[PDB]
């Protein structure tokens, strides 16, 4: 599955969601270079105006493109489950607000890596930072902690994200994630480690549609040479 | 059988294998000069791309071409079994990985020496050095220890090969081998000894097919 | 950023590479004089013997030093991205052989212009001109073609290099390159043009380490 | 490899042989001046009396000392393979008699050019000109024809020698030779040509041991 990430791979992303009764859809296209843990993606909201702030969907909208140092490659679960893929699930808790439940399947469809996602958000405050759109248009760096779940034959992941708010405060979100292989093949279960991630959010000036462009860098770490 | 190795002899090699369900085939041609313990062989993978690293097949892919010093000629089992030939079997254990079971018949077909081989590899890690293709394209020198097995009227052989890995480590492979004659004629059973072997691996630049070219020198020793 | 290239500027270069599994490193130090489009650089292989020929690394191992004629100064992308720098990426295809995927960041570290580089080579023939080391120790002149990529807010470049081979033939390498700014400031997008380049390769006689000394002249052209 | 042959170079020669079961050894020392295609060598039989006539060993007992005219220096395979050396092999067929199978490595050991040789002789008539020692103690001039074997990255050579016999007749010997490089470096493959050779055989009057002294001149030709 690692021989599939040697060059630039095209990515296609589709999400169908509902937040407090609000339904919307997003589509995305881009590519990734696992060689530099590099991602470039543009997303559009197909249903009109996105009901939630864009930064809240960054973590939902492809960790098989992380950069794994040569000594740690036997710890790359995501690429070992390829091409069949893996399911990725999450419950994201926004402090003092709602939460998202998400289920997605990430796999190879021909030569494109697709990420089909489903999302339900419940309990959002009508005048919170989220439904109230008080988040600012930017992102911070974060470290994603990973460990093997030998029972489900996958990995469990937990991490928190800080989102800057307009007024000067910060909105936290706790992420609980699990990944399981689709294929019956043996995957690589990793020793404990983490992923350092950095993203930048921007807009395409010639774009009339509600969208978000994203540049991200992901590198693996936390295991000794 | 020794009077057949006085000059250059053409060699014909055929392997049919399966490794963890992967099937492939190899064909080889070349010649050998018993007089200098020399061998020149080129092999091609006829099924497309070889699933295993080429250096893992070197030992399977004709010891009757070793140089046996004058004083040690009564210890040359290989040649004595000729022209009828001998069956050569092996179980090669790759440390922390799978293993190969091989069975072959080496004999004279007309004036060509042919080596007909069958190989089955089981238990290979999907991310080991072998299926993961981490072996480097080279070979080291080794010594093959030989002793008579008077009950099967043949010889038993054991030896180990070190294969360099790109990351810097080494992959070991223990070899357990037995050879028995095909013919009903009396063979030479040897006293304990070993063969000193040196090989060089290269490529033919005008070759599009998956292949390996091999130069090898084998000399007998260990008997006073 | 142009006000930084009025004199001689010290250059520091560092490359970490991997070619068909082979890891090596190189360091370089020198200076450039933008005013004459002149460069002097000496590189050493810190890991011992360089596994690939030195001429194959020339293009990877600082175009902000080109001489841009007065009328053409509004087309100097490279200097406009300074001091923050620009990312330079490339895929170099060697005819009938492997290719190099390279990524680098060129920017000012204090008063030194550093070019930090990463290189990966895949698919090289084991007996090609490259791994087989058949390239002669010299370089030819070439023109590098440039155009703006208003999309990535950078430029796209493509050119080809001829490398002399010992036997008398020539090895070609097609270069595809993209440069993008690191800073959020506005850069100069150029009209189409090219850079005329001339280089000379030599050795430092008192140097025991594997190295290459390089003299190069770069001048911008093609705009009326 | 050419810069090594600018002056006088000491040569050291060692041959271990067997002719129809007869084992003997020879040692030789001397020097060669590539600039004049000049050679002076003295050989001794260390095992006692040499079992075969001395003139039969001349061609076996260092062609990298041939003079190559200036316009023909790109055709010098022998010196380009230096200092790593080359392997030289031969089957010499004596008309109506046995034949010699020889293998040799010629290379630089420090500052001495060494020629280590191995020879086997089979099928010699017990009443022939060779074992019967009927050859006269002299040598003739000959032309050695050369061509590239781009296959083996070497050269093939064939030539014949006439040996005077005491009764008035002549003994012919057909030489089939192949030279291949030891080093992995690129060598010069030549266009067809030949070497003109002249030798004189004599004895050292103060020498009690079986020996042969040899003066020989070799000059390259056949290329416009």
Please answer yes or no on whether B36 and D103 come within 8 Å at the CB atom. yes
Which of C23, C101, C105 to probe the A interface (max A CBs under 10 A)? C101
Interface test with C, best of A36, A37, A201, A207 (most C CBs within 10 A): A36
Using CA coordinates, name the residue in chain B closest to C22: B166
Tell me if chain C has a CB within 8 Å of the CB of D186: yes
Alpha-helical regions (H) of chain B: 77-80
Tell whether C111 lies on the interface with B, counting CB pairs under 8 A. no
DSSP state of A6: S
Residue in chain D closest to C133 (alpha carbons) equals D185
* Burial of D175 per CB tally in 10 Å (0-12, 13-18, 19+): buried
User: In the Cβ-directed half-sphere of A201, how many Cα atoms lie within 13 Å?
Assistant: 18
Structure tokens belonging to residue A211: 């969208």
Give how far B203 is from chain C: nearest CA, Å: 6
B101 min Cα distance to partner chain C (Å): 30
Torsion angles phi and psi, residue D26, rounded to 5: -135, 155
Dihedral of alpha carbons A192, A198, A201, A202, sign? negative
Bond preceding residue D83 cis, omega within 30 of 0: yes
User: Using CA atoms, how far apart are residues B131 and A203, in angstroms rounded to an integer?
Assistant: 45
If you measure CA to CA, which chain B residue comes closest to C20? B166
- D interface test, pick of B35, B204, B217, B219 with most D CB neighbours within 10 Å: B35
CA gyration radius for chain B?
Answer: 17
B126 interface with A at CB cutoff 8 Å: yes
C126/D contact by beta carbon, under 8 A: no
What is the chain A residue with the closest CA to C151?
Answer: A204
Q: Do A6 and C122 touch (CB under 8 A)?
A: yes
Cβ-count burial of D88 within 10 angstroms (0-12 exposed, 13-18 middle, 19+ buried)? Answer: buried
Least Cα distance to D204 among D213, D196, D194 occurs for: D213
Nearest-CA neighbor of D3 among D73, D104, D87? D73
- Residue C217's nearest CA partner among C202, C200, C198, C201 is C198
Q: What whole-number distance in Å separates Cα of residue C96 and Cα of residue C93?
A: 9
Q: How far is CA B179 from the centre of its chain?
A: 12
Q: Mind telling me how many Å the CA of D198 is from chain B's nearest CA?
A: 32
Q: Nearest to residue A64, comparing CAs of A51, A89, A81, A47?
A: A81
CA distance, residue B206 to nearest chain D CA (Å): 10
Scanning every residue of chain B, which has its alpha carbon at the shortest distance from the alpha carbon of A70? B167
Q: Cα–Cα distance between C194 and C191 in angstroms, integer?
A: 10
Please name which of B200, B191, B199, B201 lies closest in space to residue B221, comparing C-alpha atoms: B191
Give Cα D155 distance to the centre of its chain.
Answer: 15
**Is the Cα dihedral D195, D200, D204, D209 positive or negative?**
positive
Q: How was this structure determined?
A: X-ray
> Given CB atoms, is B202 within the 8 Å cutoff of chain D?
no
Six-digit token pair at A169? 């405060």
How many whole angstroms separate alpha carbon B217 and alpha carbon B36?
Answer: 8
The single-letter DSSP state of residue B125 is -
Cβ–Cβ contact C166 with D under 8 A: yes
Residue pair D48/D210 in contact (Cβ under 8 Å)? The answer is yes
Q: Using a CB-CB distance cutoff of 8 angstroms, which residues of chain C are in contact with residue A36? A: 103, 118
Task: Extract the tokens encoding A127.
Answer: 């005048």
Q: Set out the domains of chain D in order of their start, with CATH numbers.
A: 1-224 (2.40.155.10)
CB B182 within 8 A of CB B77: no
The closest alpha carbon to D148, from D97, D187, D202, D96, belongs to: D187
CB pairs under 8 A between A and C: 6
CA–CA distance from A57 to each of A104, A133, A211, B69, D14 (Å)?
13, 13, 12, 78, 82
Does D170 contact B at CB distance below 8 Å? no
Task: Please indicate if any CB of chain C lies within 8 Å of the CB of D69.
Answer: no
Of the candidates C25, C20, C73, which has an alpha carbon nearest to the alpha carbon of residue C48? C25
Radius of gyration of chain A (CA): 17
CA D46/CA A96 separation, integer angstroms = 101
CA distance A125 to A134: 12
Size of interface C-D (CB pairs under 8 A): 3
The DSSP-derived string for A143-209 is EEEEEEETTTTEEEEEEEEEEEBTTS-EEEEEEEEEEEESSSS--PPPPSEEEEEEEEEE--TT--S
User: Is A186 an interface residue toward B (CB < 8 Å)?
Assistant: yes
**Residue B203: which of C21, C22, C125 has the nearest Cβ?**
C125
Q: Is D144 helix (H, G, I), strand (E, B) or coil?
A: strand
Token code pair at residue B31: 């010649």
| Residue D101 to residue D122: CA distance in whole angstroms | 8
Report in angstroms the alpha-carbon separations of D19 from A192, B79, C105, D103, D128: 72, 22, 71, 14, 13
Is residue B209 within 8 angstroms of chain C, CB to CB?
no
A6–C contact, CB cutoff 8 A:
yes
User: CA angle C7-C13-C17, nearest 5°?
Assistant: 160
| Ordered DSSP codes for D31-72 | EEEGGGTEEEEEEEETTSS-SS-GGGSTTT--GGG-B--GGG
Short-list C73, C90, C82, CA closest to C113: C82
Residue of B nearest to D119 (CA): B35
Contact B129, B171 (CB under 8 A): yes
Could you give the count of Cα atoms lying within 13 Å of D218 in the half-sphere of its Cβ? 19
The DSSP annotation for A16-61 comes to EEEETTEEEEEEEEEEEETTTTEEEEEEEETTSS-SS-GGGGTTT-
Residues in A closer than 8 angstroms to B126, CB to CB, are 185-186
Closest CA to D69 of D193, D160, D183: D193
* Residue B74 near chain C (CB below 8 Å): no
Q: Do chains C and B touch (3 or more CB pairs under 8 A)?
A: yes
Tell if the CB–CB gap between A36 and C118 is shorter than 8 Å: yes
Chain B residue with Cα closest to A76? B127
Q: What are A110's two structure tokens?
A: 């021909």
Task: Name subunits touching B (3+ CB pairs < 8 A).
Answer: A, C, D
Nearest C-alpha in A relative to C103: A36
Distances from the Cα of C37 to the Cαs of C12, C195, C215, D165, in angstroms? 17, 10, 11, 78
Residues 6+ apart with CB under 8 A from D127: none
């Amino acid at each position: 599955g690692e021989e599939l990430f040697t060059g630039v791979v095209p990515i296609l992303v589709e999400l169908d969601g509902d937040v407090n009764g609000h339904k919307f859809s997003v589509s995305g296209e881009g590519e990734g270079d696992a060689t530099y843990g590099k991602l470039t993606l543009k997303f559009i909201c197909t249903t009109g105006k996105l009901p939630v702030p864009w930064p809240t969907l960054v973590t939902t909208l492809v960790q098989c493109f992380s950069r794994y140092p040569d000594h740690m490659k036997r710890h790359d679960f995501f690429k070992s489950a390829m091409p069949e893929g893996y399911v990725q699930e999450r419950t994201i808790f926004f402090k003092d607000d709602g939460n998202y439940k998400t289920r997605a399947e990430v796999k190879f469809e021909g030569d494109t890596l697709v990420n089909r996602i489903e999302l339900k958000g419940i309990d959002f405050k009508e005048d919170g930072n989220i439904l109230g759109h008080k988040l600012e248009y930017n992102y911070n760096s974060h470290n994603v902690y990973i460990m093997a779940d030998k029972q489900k034959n996958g990995i469990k992941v937990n991490f928190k994200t800080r989102h800057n708010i307009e007024d000067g405060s910060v909105q936290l979100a706790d992420h609980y994630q699990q990944n399981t292989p689709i294929g019956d093949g043996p995957v690589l279960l990793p020793d404990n480690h983490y992923l350092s991630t950095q993203s930048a959010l921007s807009k395409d000036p010639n774009e009339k549609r509600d969208h978000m462009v994203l540049l991200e860098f992901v590198t693996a770490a936390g295991i000794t040479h």
